Amino acid sequence: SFVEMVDNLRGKSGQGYYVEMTVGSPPQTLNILVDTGSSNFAVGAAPHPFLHRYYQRQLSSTYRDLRKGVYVPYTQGKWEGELGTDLVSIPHGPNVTVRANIAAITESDKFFINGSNWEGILGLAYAEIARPDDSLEPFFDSLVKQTHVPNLFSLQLCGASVGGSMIIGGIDHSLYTGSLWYTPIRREWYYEVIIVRVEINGQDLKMDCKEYNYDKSIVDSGTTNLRLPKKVFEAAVKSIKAASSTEGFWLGEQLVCWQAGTTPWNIFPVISLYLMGEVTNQSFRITILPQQYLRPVDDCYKFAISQSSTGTVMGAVIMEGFYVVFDRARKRIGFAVSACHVHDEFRTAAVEGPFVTLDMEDCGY
């Protein structure tokens, strides 16, 4: 039941959230990064200087080889390895065992992070973006096909040492407040959504909404940042600079620092994303505070908004403080402020609707 799954995720800031899983017979225990921006279940299966532990296929009696290699590239990092299948379970998830596809990772470049403490990646999106091709059924599909776990999951990620919940199979009503607001998954590959308006401190950014979605906007819990397309990224920074003109960093390369507890939170604006809703001409908005897009790294911070080579990418930083529901069953993603919400002296992060927005169809690429 859901109480066993609450707080089943861990992290280091800016390095991802993982969940304990076990693979094989007998079970090998591994920490697996939870990723909504990809679709391959893969694990280190070979010594690496950043891996404390890895998958030993030859120790497992249920491992079957598929005699077939694979390569997977990501925003940061890439790996290749051998596809097989094996028995998989989630200790603090639903009480089941599935046979799932598994990529034994043999070579990697910039993929494993030093001191990250995860040793694998669970892609939670759809077959279509699965390597080598869409016939390699992704973990979540196998789980839904082979057991009675309903076709949906929720992510509640929290910031500082980093924790949260993956409610697999449902929604835990105690982990958020107010109502859940939904947005169509435009297409079942990435968790693709449409952003229809963007406001900075209450001011519309005045751009054509095709710009926000230049290519595709996605919810990617495997990336840290809020990534905006060039044109939008440039407008955002110009607004954020102006709102904070009162005080290199803007490119995310270097930290800024303040004497413990005097972070001038008030001089940094709130950003509002309006997402397409479930009814005609209707949207809703999520409001993000400086405390989300200035990443805790004296209290020090990295700027967590960077330039994108796709559309708008809602990374780990935007999801922090929200309860997000991946309602695959009904082709929608749900947003609410969670229990572990962001704390500011004079403002709240919020999920507010309904809003009316004409011509939302125009914003799609």
Ligand SMILES: CC(C)C[C@H](NC(=O)[C@@H](NC(=O)[C@@H](N)CNC(=O)c1nnn[nH]1)C(C)C)C(=O)NC[C@](O)(CCc1ccccc1)C(=O)Nc1cccc(C(=O)O)c1
């Ligand atoms: C580097 C990354 C953005 C590549 C991209 N990878 C992914 O999307 C992976 N997911 C992720 O990386 C996630 N962080 C979420 N997605 C994004 O951030 C994002 N998607 N698009 N832009 N950004 C998985 C879904 C595998 C991909 O597979 N893209 C598809 C493709 O464009 C196809 C290219 C191709 C050309 C001709 C025939 C067939 C395919 C791609 O490989 N692109 C691509 C671009 C640059 C480098 C590399 C590389 O291998 O190093 C690959």
